[PDB]
């Protein structure tokens, strides 16, 4: 761990600076270093961890999709063989993406999840575990089935806790439901489950808005709009 010699507080400060500078690989490395100090993460710190790795893996997913599309075209009926380079480079990006997902899953398993007792932290980390198995599933082929079930299992455990312990407008609960619904649609080939979850999530949050402050209202309605965006594409 290259960050072993830096103070925890310094790593967090530098993570925030890296975010401001849009240096998300640095941000992720700082937050990994902070996690490896062994202490639980605060709410702000959990969000720094998630933002950093989401940005890193996001660039990799976008690149992988570009290359996978080029690869497919080069295999269509009537394409000129362009040698191994597209496949080779797609495999390179794919391997780097898998390495990042494996790093995140490692932090969750050693030892963020097991030390997470409060619902807000445990649901947050289980959602992350679902998300990074989902990103692995997007590039998998054969043990795709096992990866998909790992994602499903993480998301389901998060959903069970969130429904027992959080209000329907809680933003963590809402973002979990959004992502699990996209899992159902894109990964599990269960569009009806995806639509049902999105609708039920949206309707139950609508009925709980009346309890929120102006600040909380803005936070919940933001994610609700994403559920609605998806439902519009799906129905």
């Amino acid at each position: 761990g290259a960050m072993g010699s830096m103070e925890r507080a310094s790593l967090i400060q530098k993570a925030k600076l890296a975010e401001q500078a849009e240096r998300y690989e640095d941000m992720a490395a700082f937050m990994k270093g902070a996690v490896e100090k062994g202490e639980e993460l605060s709410c702000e710190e959990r969000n720094l961890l998630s933002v950093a790795y989401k940005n890193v893996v996001g660039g990799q997913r976008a690149a992988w999709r570009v290359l996978s599309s080029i690869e497919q075209k080069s295999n269509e009926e009537g394409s000129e063989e362009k040698g191994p380079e597209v496949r080779e480079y797609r495999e390179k990006v794919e391997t780097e993406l898998q390495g990042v997902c494996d790093t995140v899953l490692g932090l969750l398993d050693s030892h963020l999840i097991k030390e997470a007792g409060d619902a807000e932290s445990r649901v947050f980390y289980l959602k992350m575990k679902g998300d990074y198995y989902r990103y692995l599933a997007e590039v998998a082929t054969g043990d795709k089935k096992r990866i998909i079930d790992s994602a499903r299992s993480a998301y389901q455990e998060a959903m069970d806790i969130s429904k027992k312990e959080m209000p329907p407008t809680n933003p963590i609960r809402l973002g979990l439901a959004l992502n699990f619904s996209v899992f159902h649609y894109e990964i599990a080939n269960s569009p009806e489950e995806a639509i049902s979850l999105a609708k039920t999530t949206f309707d139950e949050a609508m009925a709980d808005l009346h309890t929120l402050s102006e600040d909380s209202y803005k936070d919940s309605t933001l994610i609700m709009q994403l559920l609605r965006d998806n439902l519009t594409l799906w129905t």
């Binding site: 989401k54 940005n55 998300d131 979990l176 649609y185 894109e186 994403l226």
Partner: peptide
């Protein structure tokens, strides 16, 4: 890409 939580 359908909408998921957080950045991008």
């Amino acid at each position: 890409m359908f909408k998921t939580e957080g950045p991008d």
